[PDB]
Amino acid sequence: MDKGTQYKDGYYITTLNYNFNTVYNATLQAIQNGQTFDYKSNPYDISVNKNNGTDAEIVSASDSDSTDSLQVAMKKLPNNATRISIKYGSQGNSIRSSALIGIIEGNIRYANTH
């Protein structure tokens, strides 16, 4: 039905039916190039960016948000899909993440088209 967007206890987890290569690119752009700002204008910038090959995971630390860090996990599926797992702070990071996903998929939709 849907790609697989699940929200549970602050966690935002989804599958994106697009290639891990483009998903990494889009996700990087979304956070790194400041394609999304929060109302509290909090530091979104990346503290660890690492590629594995089946993993690409972005970890940014939040100094202003004492409650946690921004962690986005991108996992490569052999079905030309990518699984994204978001890490939340006690305030509910799912809000940031829902916008994040829109940007990630949307950017792919422009670049990839079909």
Side-chain angles (χ1 to χ4, degrees):
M1 182 183 66
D2 172 76
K3 30 168 169 47
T5 303
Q6 311 176 212
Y7 54 96
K8 190 69 265 291
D9 309 308
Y11 290 104
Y12 202 87
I13 310 174
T14 186
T15 310
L16 193 56
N17 297 32
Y18 281 108
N19 292 34
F20 170 80
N21 306 88
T22 183
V23 180
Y24 171 74
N25 195 149
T27 304
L28 181 62
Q29 293 175 268
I31 179 181
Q32 169 188 269
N33 291 89
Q35 300 298 270
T36 184
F37 298 93
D38 186 78
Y39 182 77
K40 70 181 75 182
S41 184
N42 62 333
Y44 50 78
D45 180 41
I46 306 176
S47 311
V48 174
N49 181 332
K50 43 74 177 187
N51 62 272
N52 163 270
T54 206
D55 157 74
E57 189 167 84
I58 315 300
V59 184
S60 308
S62 303
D63 57 278
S64 303
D65 295 82
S66 181
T67 177
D68 209 271
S69 49
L70 183 292
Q71 168 180 88
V72 178
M74 306 175 286
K75 266 59 265 181
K76 184 188 74 282
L77 284 301
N79 301 88
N80 294 272
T82 311
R83 182 67 171 175
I84 273 68
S85 306
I86 299 291
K87 171 67 192 309
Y88 79 115
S90 184
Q91 61 189 330
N93 190 28
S94 44
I95 293 69
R96 292 278 82 238
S97 308
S98 195
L100 192 63
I101 295 302
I103 299 166
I104 298 172
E105 60 169 83
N107 180 87
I108 298 168
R109 306 188 185 279
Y110 294 120
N112 189 147
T113 52
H114 50 50

CSV table of all heavy atoms in Angstrom, one decimal, residues 76-103:
chain,number,residue,atom,x,y,z
A,76,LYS,N,20.2,-0.5,3.0
A,76,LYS,CA,20.0,-0.8,1.7
A,76,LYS,C,19.3,-2.1,1.5
A,76,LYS,O,19.8,-3.1,2.0
A,76,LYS,CB,21.3,-0.8,0.9
A,76,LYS,CG,21.1,-1.1,-0.6
A,76,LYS,CD,22.4,-1.4,-1.4
A,76,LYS,CE,23.0,-2.7,-1.1
A,76,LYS,NZ,23.7,-2.9,0.2
A,77,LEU,N,18.2,-2.1,0.8
A,77,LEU,CA,17.5,-3.4,0.5
A,77,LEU,C,17.8,-3.8,-1.0
A,77,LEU,O,18.0,-2.9,-1.8
A,77,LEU,CB,15.9,-3.2,0.6
A,77,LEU,CG,15.4,-3.2,2.1
A,77,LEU,CD1,15.7,-4.5,2.8
A,77,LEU,CD2,15.8,-2.0,2.9
A,78,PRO,N,17.9,-5.1,-1.2
A,78,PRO,CA,18.2,-5.6,-2.6
A,78,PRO,C,17.1,-5.5,-3.6
A,78,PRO,O,17.1,-5.9,-4.7
A,78,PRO,CB,18.6,-7.0,-2.3
A,78,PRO,CG,17.8,-7.4,-1.1
A,78,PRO,CD,17.6,-6.2,-0.3
A,79,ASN,N,16.0,-4.9,-3.1
A,79,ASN,CA,14.8,-4.7,-3.9
A,79,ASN,C,14.7,-3.3,-4.4
A,79,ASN,O,13.7,-2.9,-4.9
A,79,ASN,CB,13.5,-5.0,-3.0
A,79,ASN,CG,13.5,-6.3,-2.3
A,79,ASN,OD1,14.1,-6.5,-1.3
A,79,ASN,ND2,12.9,-7.3,-3.0
A,80,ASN,N,15.9,-2.7,-4.4
A,80,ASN,CA,16.0,-1.2,-4.9
A,80,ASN,C,15.2,-0.3,-4.0
A,80,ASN,O,14.6,0.6,-4.4
A,80,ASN,CB,15.6,-1.0,-6.4
A,80,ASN,CG,16.5,-1.7,-7.4
A,80,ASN,OD1,17.5,-1.2,-7.8
A,80,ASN,ND2,16.1,-3.0,-7.7
A,81,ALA,N,15.3,-0.7,-2.7
A,81,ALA,CA,14.6,0.1,-1.7
A,81,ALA,C,15.5,0.4,-0.6
A,81,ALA,O,16.6,-0.2,-0.4
A,81,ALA,CB,13.4,-0.7,-1.2
A,82,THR,N,15.2,1.4,0.2
A,82,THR,CA,16.0,1.8,1.4
A,82,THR,C,15.1,1.9,2.6
A,82,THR,O,14.0,2.4,2.6
A,82,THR,CB,16.6,3.1,1.0
A,82,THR,OG1,17.2,3.1,-0.3
A,82,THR,CG2,17.7,3.5,2.0
A,83,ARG,N,15.6,1.4,3.7
A,83,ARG,CA,14.8,1.4,5.0
A,83,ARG,C,15.4,2.5,5.8
A,83,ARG,O,16.6,2.5,6.0
A,83,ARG,CB,14.9,0.1,5.7
A,83,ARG,CG,14.1,-0.1,7.0
A,83,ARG,CD,12.6,0.0,6.8
A,83,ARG,NE,11.9,-0.4,8.0
A,83,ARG,CZ,10.5,-0.3,8.2
A,83,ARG,NH1,9.7,0.1,7.2
A,83,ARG,NH2,10.0,-0.7,9.3
A,84,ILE,N,14.6,3.4,6.3
A,84,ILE,CA,15.0,4.5,7.1
A,84,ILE,C,14.5,4.3,8.5
A,84,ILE,O,13.3,4.0,8.7
A,84,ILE,CB,14.7,5.9,6.5
A,84,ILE,CG1,15.7,6.4,5.5
A,84,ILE,CG2,14.4,7.0,7.5
A,84,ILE,CD1,15.9,5.6,4.2
A,85,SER,N,15.3,4.5,9.4
A,85,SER,CA,15.0,4.5,10.8
A,85,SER,C,15.5,5.8,11.4
A,85,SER,O,16.6,6.2,11.2
A,85,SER,CB,15.6,3.3,11.5
A,85,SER,OG,15.2,2.1,10.7
A,86,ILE,N,14.6,6.4,12.1
A,86,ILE,CA,14.9,7.7,12.8
A,86,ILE,C,15.0,7.5,14.3
A,86,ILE,O,14.3,6.6,14.8
A,86,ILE,CB,13.7,8.7,12.5
A,86,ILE,CG1,13.5,9.0,11.0
A,86,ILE,CG2,13.9,10.0,13.3
A,86,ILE,CD1,14.6,9.8,10.3
A,87,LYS,N,15.8,8.2,14.9
A,87,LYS,CA,16.0,8.2,16.3
A,87,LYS,C,15.4,9.4,16.9
A,87,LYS,O,15.5,10.5,16.3
A,87,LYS,CB,17.5,8.2,16.6
A,87,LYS,CG,17.9,8.3,18.1
A,87,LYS,CD,17.4,7.2,18.9
A,87,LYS,CE,17.5,7.5,20.4
A,87,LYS,NZ,18.8,8.0,20.8
A,88,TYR,N,14.6,9.3,18.0
A,88,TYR,CA,13.9,10.4,18.5
A,88,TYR,C,14.4,10.8,19.8
A,88,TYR,O,15.1,10.1,20.6
A,88,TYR,CB,12.4,10.0,18.6
A,88,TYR,CG,12.1,9.1,19.9
A,88,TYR,CD1,11.3,9.6,20.9
A,88,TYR,CD2,12.6,7.9,20.0
A,88,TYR,CE1,11.0,8.9,22.0
A,88,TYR,CE2,12.3,7.1,21.2
A,88,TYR,CZ,11.5,7.7,22.1
A,88,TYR,OH,11.2,6.9,23.3
A,89,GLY,N,14.2,12.1,20.1
A,89,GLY,CA,14.4,12.6,21.4
A,89,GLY,C,13.0,12.6,22.1
A,89,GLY,O,12.0,12.5,21.4
A,90,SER,N,13.0,12.8,23.4
A,90,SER,CA,11.8,12.6,24.2
A,90,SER,C,10.6,13.6,23.8
A,90,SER,O,9.5,13.4,24.2
A,90,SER,CB,12.1,12.8,25.7
A,90,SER,OG,11.0,12.6,26.6
A,91,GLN,N,11.0,14.6,23.0
A,91,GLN,CA,10.0,15.6,22.6
A,91,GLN,C,9.3,15.1,21.3
A,91,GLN,O,8.3,15.7,20.8
A,91,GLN,CB,10.7,16.9,22.3
A,91,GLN,CG,11.8,16.7,21.2
A,91,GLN,CD,12.7,18.0,21.0
A,91,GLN,OE1,12.3,19.1,21.3
A,91,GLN,NE2,13.9,17.7,20.6
A,92,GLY,N,9.7,14.0,20.7
A,92,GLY,CA,9.1,13.5,19.5
A,92,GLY,C,9.8,14.0,18.3
A,92,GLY,O,9.5,15.1,17.8
A,93,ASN,N,10.7,13.3,17.7
A,93,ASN,CA,11.5,13.7,16.6
A,93,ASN,C,10.8,13.5,15.3
A,93,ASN,O,11.2,13.9,14.2
A,93,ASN,CB,12.9,13.1,16.6
A,93,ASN,CG,13.9,13.7,15.6
A,93,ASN,OD1,13.8,14.9,15.2
A,93,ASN,ND2,14.9,12.9,15.2
A,94,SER,N,9.7,12.7,15.4
A,94,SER,CA,8.9,12.3,14.3
A,94,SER,C,8.4,13.5,13.4
A,94,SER,O,8.2,13.5,12.2
A,94,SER,CB,7.7,11.5,14.8
A,94,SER,OG,7.2,12.1,16.0
A,95,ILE,N,8.2,14.7,14.1
A,95,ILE,CA,7.8,15.9,13.5
A,95,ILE,C,8.8,16.4,12.4
A,95,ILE,O,8.5,16.6,11.3
A,95,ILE,CB,7.5,17.1,14.5
A,95,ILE,CG1,6.3,16.8,15.4
A,95,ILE,CG2,7.3,18.4,13.8
A,95,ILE,CD1,6.4,15.7,16.4
A,96,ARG,N,10.1,16.5,12.9
A,96,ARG,CA,11.2,16.8,12.0
A,96,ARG,C,11.3,15.8,10.9
A,96,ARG,O,11.5,16.2,9.7
A,96,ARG,CB,12.5,16.7,12.8
A,96,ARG,CG,12.8,17.7,14.0
A,96,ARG,CD,13.3,19.1,13.5
A,96,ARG,NE,12.3,20.0,12.9
A,96,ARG,CZ,12.2,20.5,11.7
A,96,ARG,NH1,13.0,20.1,10.7
A,96,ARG,NH2,11.3,21.4,11.5
A,97,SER,N,11.2,14.6,11.3
A,97,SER,CA,11.4,13.4,10.4
A,97,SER,C,10.4,13.3,9.3
A,97,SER,O,10.7,12.9,8.2
A,97,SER,CB,11.4,12.2,11.2
A,97,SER,OG,12.3,12.4,12.3
A,98,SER,N,9.1,13.7,9.6
A,98,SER,CA,8.1,13.6,8.6
A,98,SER,C,8.4,14.6,7.4
A,98,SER,O,8.2,14.3,6.3
A,98,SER,CB,6.7,13.9,9.2
A,98,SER,OG,5.6,13.5,8.4
A,99,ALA,N,8.9,15.8,7.8
A,99,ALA,CA,9.3,16.8,6.8
A,99,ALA,C,10.5,16.3,6.1
A,99,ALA,O,10.7,16.5,4.9
A,99,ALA,CB,9.5,18.1,7.5
A,100,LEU,N,11.5,15.7,6.9
A,100,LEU,CA,12.7,15.2,6.3
A,100,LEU,C,12.5,14.2,5.2
A,100,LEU,O,13.0,14.3,4.1
A,100,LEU,CB,13.5,14.5,7.5
A,100,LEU,CG,15.0,14.1,7.2
A,100,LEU,CD1,15.8,15.4,6.9
A,100,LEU,CD2,15.5,13.3,8.3
A,101,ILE,N,11.6,13.2,5.5
A,101,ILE,CA,11.2,12.2,4.5
A,101,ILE,C,10.6,12.8,3.2
A,101,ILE,O,11.0,12.4,2.1
A,101,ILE,CB,10.2,11.2,5.1
A,101,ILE,CG1,10.9,10.4,6.2
A,101,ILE,CG2,9.6,10.2,4.0
A,101,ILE,CD1,12.2,9.6,5.8
A,102,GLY,N,9.8,13.8,3.4
A,102,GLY,CA,9.2,14.5,2.2
A,102,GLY,C,10.2,15.1,1.3
A,102,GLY,O,10.1,15.0,0.1
A,103,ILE,N,11.3,15.7,1.9
A,103,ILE,CA,12.4,16.2,1.2
A,103,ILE,C,13.2,15.1,0.5
A,103,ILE,O,13.5,15.3,-0.7
A,103,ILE,CB,13.2,17.0,2.2
A,103,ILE,CG1,12.4,18.2,2.8
A,103,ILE,CG2,14.5,17.6,1.4
A,103,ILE,CD1,13.1,18.8,4.0
